[PDB]
Design a protein around this ligand. Sequence first.
Ligand code: SF4
Lengths: 117, 118
Amino acid sequence: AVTGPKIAIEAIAQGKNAARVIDSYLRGKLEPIKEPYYVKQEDLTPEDFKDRERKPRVPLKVANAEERKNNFREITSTMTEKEAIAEASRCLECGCMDYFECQLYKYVNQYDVDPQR
Amino acid sequence: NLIFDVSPVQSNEGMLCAFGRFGIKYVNDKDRILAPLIKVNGELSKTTFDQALIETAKKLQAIRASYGKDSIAIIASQRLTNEEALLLTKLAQKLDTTVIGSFDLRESVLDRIFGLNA
Ligand code: SF4
């Protein structure tokens, strides 16, 4: 109703942010949504990951076109537990392991830093 | 969950025939189907009630869409209760078809003479 036709996760994000702002407003302290500052690595290129073992992605089971075009049954299937664990084990763990306890992140989010200069 | 006997009531001649007395044997039949079947890979296979009903609704709606009004026939056994027959008529009304009848239904002449086929 506000952004026009988008994907559903954008609508969910809008609903969650609006819920946050409405909860603040119901307390008399209407606060806009503040975007946190995150340290990122924009310089990473494929040769930085050239030593990792290559592992295949979990295959997606798709129903046969001839049979599926005649019915309204689900086209794709949910993966199995073995495939789920094997696929989750492929993650490279890009995020910082200290994110939930790092004091530097907390302090740089308490003070409006402009570190690009 | 098994039927063991049938007795006539003591009302008028207190009688049943072969059907009413002995044809209740189909209730205990082991060949009764208890789960729905839908055609996968061209053969009927067991499924759940929700999936089968959704498939039925989609098949009937597709026929009605691609062929129009009065393209689905609802042929019902005359052993169903009055409520099931009425609900089937309402289903034909929602399916946009007036073709609801029975293959055991005799041609009617009393409604043309007296008004009601009764
Ligand atoms: S943390 Fe895992 S899922 Fe997220 S970008 Fe890195 S490899 Fe992909």
